[PDB]
Amino acid sequence: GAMAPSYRVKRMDIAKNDEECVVNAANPRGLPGDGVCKAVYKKWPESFKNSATPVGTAKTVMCGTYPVIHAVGPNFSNYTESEGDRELAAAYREVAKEVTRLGVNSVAIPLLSTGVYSGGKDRLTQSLNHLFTAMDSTDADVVIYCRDKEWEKKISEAIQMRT
Ligand SMILES: N#C[C@@H]1CCS(=O)(=O)C1
Ligand SMILES: [Cl-]
Ligand SMILES: [Cl-]
Ligand SMILES: [Cl-]
């Protein structure tokens, strides 16, 4: 565990993270994909060996000794709002289990289903709250990665509001 477990946000590529493990915003088939998933494929291609896993689940594969937690958020193009919400919450609960099992003191996490799986909606608050719901009972330092300047401000605001 971290001595004083925290949440932070950074605006940069999660493939350059300074944490003990990474969460991939994976597809269910373990394909290289786009966005975060492709950056993760380029950095930790070895972690894509048998990484395929269903929607709402997380599967960890080592790259050397570095854990890559493949978390499959729903594609809101395919799911109803209600079912997509349920699966997005579930993916994050599975990430919390894996982070706990691995015994890491820090984890780099993107906001699941906020990019090409968002169904063209802004899901910052929805995705972040499900992240908090899952990770609040863990003692790892959580570092959230984003790419948009306005999202960095809103995530930072949401973290500070609860401190
Ligand atoms: N990043 C991202 C989204 C989820 C996996 S993907 O690369 O297929 C699209
Ligand atoms: Cl960067
Ligand atoms: Cl996405
Ligand atoms: Cl972003």
UniProtKB/Swiss-Prot annotation:
Stretches assigned to the Macro domain: 4-163
Reported effect, V36A: Partial loss of mono-ADP-ribosylhydrolase activity
Residues that hold ADP-D-ribose according to the record: D13, N27, G35, G115, V116, Y117
Superkingdom, taxonomy of origin: Viruses
Bilayer topology term: Peripheral membrane protein
Post-translational modification: Phosphorylated by host on serines and threonines.
Localization of this protein: Host cytoplasmic vesicle membrane
Domain notes from UniProt: In the N-terminus, the macro domain displays a mono-ADP-ribosylhydrolase activity. The central part called, the alphavirus unique domain (AUD) has a zinc-binding function. The C-terminus region, also called hypervariable domain (HVD), is mainly disordered and binds several host proteins. This intrinsically disordered domain contains 2 SH3 domain-binding sites and 2 FGDF motifs necessary and sufficient for the formation of nsP3/G3BP complexes.
Quaternary data: Interacts with mRNA-capping enzyme nsP1. Interacts (via C-terminus) with host G3BP1; this interaction inhibits the formation of host stress granules on viral mRNAs and the nsp3-G3BP1 complexes bind viral RNAs and probably orchestrate the assembly of viral replication complexes. Interacts (via C-terminus) with host G3BP2; this interaction inhibits the formation of host stress granules on viral mRNAs and the nsp3-G3BP2 complexes bind viral RNAs and probably orchestrate the assembly of viral replication complexes. Interacts (via C-terminus) with host NAP1L1.
Functional summary from the UniProt entry: Seems to be essential for minus-strand RNAs and subgenomic 26S mRNAs synthesis. Displays mono-ADP-ribosylhydrolase activity. ADP-ribosylation is a post-translational modification that controls various processes of the host cell and the virus probably needs to revert it for optimal viral replication. Binds proteins of G3BP family and sequesters them into the viral RNA replication complexes thereby inhibiting the formation of host stress granules on viral mRNAs.
Protein name: Non-structural protein 3
Species name: Chikungunya virus (strain S27-African prototype) (CHIKV)
Full protein stretch here: 1334 to 1493 of 2474
